[model samples]
Target: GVFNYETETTSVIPAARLFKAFILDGDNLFPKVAPQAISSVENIEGNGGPGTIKKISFPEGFPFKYVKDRVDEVDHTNFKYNYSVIEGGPIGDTLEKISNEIKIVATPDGGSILKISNKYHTKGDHEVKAEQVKASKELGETLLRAVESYLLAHSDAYN
Candidate 1:
């Protein structure tokens, strides 16, 4: 079975800045912002275009030591990014894969809206629990807030 989840968050940062910081520079920015959770991100294949694979390594205390995500699409003009977790992380005997689509849209106030959609493909009849989804979402929000705070403090970051 496959389970789909969608959520959105508003940010005080502009769409372009947020997109650049969150997507384009995520490889470096993540480790800097959340060093406790993410230790490093390395590009394993391609030149950051579709089919490019990224290996994200986490610290010892993190739940998963590492995860590999493959880029499926990158629309710079539209501030949209799509990727899939093909190996490691939460994927195992119960889950086949996890696909994510993220978009940043500008708001009238010069801020932006971050929209995220996640598709969880489970193995056989395995089910995804609500608590698992909630915890993952909360972790994501925490990371986003950390990035937002970093950008706010830096002021010129991803400008």
Candidate 2:
């Protein structure tokens, strides 16, 4: 009833910082990095770890108005994060739910290798296209690039 896909991207930022940004501080930093695309993030329930619910809102013209996600797992020691889209725009469409798993690992060059696995649970006979998922992945890469630029420039930030 679902489609599976994954994307890999590399970042010059360290794994720990990137992992922290994605799991712990993303709600605060995402809007700062992509103000035009993202409007804001609000935590509706629970702390940052598992069971937490967060709403990520996009701009007016954006494809999705907002997405509410529940944090499923956050393993800081392994630099792995997992979350599930439980409500809102995308889920109201062809998807039943979208589970995203992100793994960040250190590279020998002091950078990080980021891999995102997406499981798109379809709604009945609905089909989710790969291109659509690829677009989402591209957006994530863009956000990560913005964060990398910010971290590199600040040096003292996200440590």
Candidate 3:
């Protein structure tokens, strides 16, 4: 079974800045902003472009240890990004893989709206639990908020 989820997040920062800070430089920014949650992100393959694979590792107290993600698409001009989790994290007996797509659109007020879509591929007709999705969404928002706060304080970052 394949399950889909969608969400939108509004931010005071511009689309380009937010995209750069949260998507393009997330590997570096995430660890900096929330060291206790994200221990590190390492580029294990490719040169940071499409098809690149990265390993995101969490801290000792985190629920999951690590996840390997492959970059599928990156459109800097349009503030769009796509990636897929190939291993670890929530992937196991229930899930085969997970894909994510993100688009940041600029608002007239100079702020931005982040659109997020998630696709979960499960095995043997298994369905993703609502609680699992909810927890993932909450964690995502928390990380985004931390990034937003960091960008707000450091005005010149990712400009």
Candidate 4:
């Protein structure tokens, strides 16, 4: 299975910080912000950095349709990282890797261009599954917004 999605938002915070809040720290996450939808991302194995087996299911009541493990880190030098799904997703079980990388181009005003991409393949036909695509886009936007909100609420968190 193959699915592609992209979403962006205009943010005042620097791109690096934004990415960290959204992806690095489960301290600020889907359940933390939108508990109504996400139940939790239980770490089946290690911590969230790299080689972490996370089973993210909606305690809002669905089983683990998408279980994944990480294989990378937040490379602050380039503001990017790469990872794969060693477990399950909407496609077949054989999801070798799903790469999501970010490019942060600094703007003149101290802002930046946060280009995020998600590229992957699965066990079957490589067609865009609309639901997963939509959810992916939504997650990007929601994650950004949640990060912004969380950061704003705790000004010291950014300092």
Candidate 5:
């Protein structure tokens, strides 16, 4: 039932600040912007930033409860995030592993183009691809919007 599929979503913000809100500070960002999206995060290791290995579990209301540890990262160059959850996440049931990436580049106008994508390999349960694609893309956008809205209100320093 595993199948291969690609899902992507994009949004054009007036300023790069919106995009920076989430990446620069994911610790406070995740819970603040999308509190319900992620139940809680355990900073098992590291201080409280990138390179910090943590176990993130989504609430039951969420479709799944997969923990994606901060496997690797490249600061502003390229962000390589990997995760392995029992039920996994959006691509959980469909793929054994969900490797996601978010590459950011600055435009001449001072704006940033955020490219985010997740690739799922068929894992015997491909039927959920359709819904997963729709939901994941939507969730990404929603999170982006939340960050933008939150940042607009508070030219934030921390979270």
Candidate 6:
């Protein structure tokens, strides 16, 4: 079965900074902050804009060694990003690839709201568990919180 959902989180970080950290400089920043979870990120093809493919490697004990995601959309002016994981990893069996669309907006209070919608593409007649959904959501939140804390401590970053 196909599944999709959206999640939102508000951060005191400025929209521009967050956008840069999450979109443009992600390859550099993600590994620095979460080296245990993500070993590295590299641009395997194209420029850093739409169509660029990034290969992400996870650490030991992770189910998958690496996954390649192609950037589908990038709107720096509006703080929007979209990508789809199309290669490598545990992309078979019950789970398939996922399309992630992100939109970050500046709040009137000078912070930002990060909204992410994910489309889970499954194989034919695949069954999804509530626990899988919950686990992914929590995992995403934990990663975001880690990035937030890193940015807070290093205010000079992504400036």
Query: What TM-score goes with each of the models?
Result: 0.85, 0.84, 0.84, 0.68, 0.65, 0.84
Q: Per-residue CA lDDT of candidate 2, range 1-159, in tens?
A: 577776778888899888888767877887888775567988889787777898878866767778788887878799888887888785664366788888899898979888888787876666777777777777777777888888888855565
RMSD of 4: 4.1
Q: What is candidate 3's lDDT per residue for 15-36, written digit by digit as tens? A: 8888888777877887888775
Worst 10 residues of 2 by lDDT: 88-97
Leading candidate by lDDT: 1
- Model 5: residues >4 Å from true position, as ranges? 1-20, 46-52, 62-66, 77-95, 125-127, 155-159
Q: Which TM-score value belongs to model 3?
A: 0.84
- How well is each residue in 1-159 modelled by candidate 1, as lDDT tens digits? 578887889998888988888788876887888776578998999766677898988766556768887887888898888787787766764365778888899899868899988887877666778876886687678777888897788745564
Kindly list the per-residue Cα lDDT of model 6 for residues 1-159, writing each as its tens digit.
567867889998887898888888866776777665567888899776887898988766756677887887888898988887788576653366678788888888968889988877777666557675786687667667777898788655574
Which parts of model 2 are misplaced by more than 4 Å?
Answer: 62-64, 90-95, 155-159
Best by TM-score: 1
Judge candidate 1 at residue 139 and give its lDDT. 63
Which ranges of candidate 4 are over 4 A from the true structure? 1-3, 26-28, 36-38, 44-47, 89-92, 95-97, 103-106, 154-159
Error of 3 at 107 (Å): 1.2
**C-alpha root-mean-square deviation, each candidate:** 3.4, 3.5, 3.6, 4.1, 5.3, 3.5
Error of 3 at 11 (Å): 1.0
Pairs of residues clashing in candidate 2: none
Q: What TM-score does prediction 1 earn? A: 0.85
Off by over 4 Å in 3: 60-64, 89-95, 155-159
- For candidate 5, write residues 1-159 as lDDT tens digits: 333333333444543444345555664577778865666676677653455566776655644564755534535334323232233455434355555555555556634465665654455534444675677676767776677566567654876
lDDT of 4 at 121: 63
Clashes of each: 0, 0, 0, 0, 8, 0
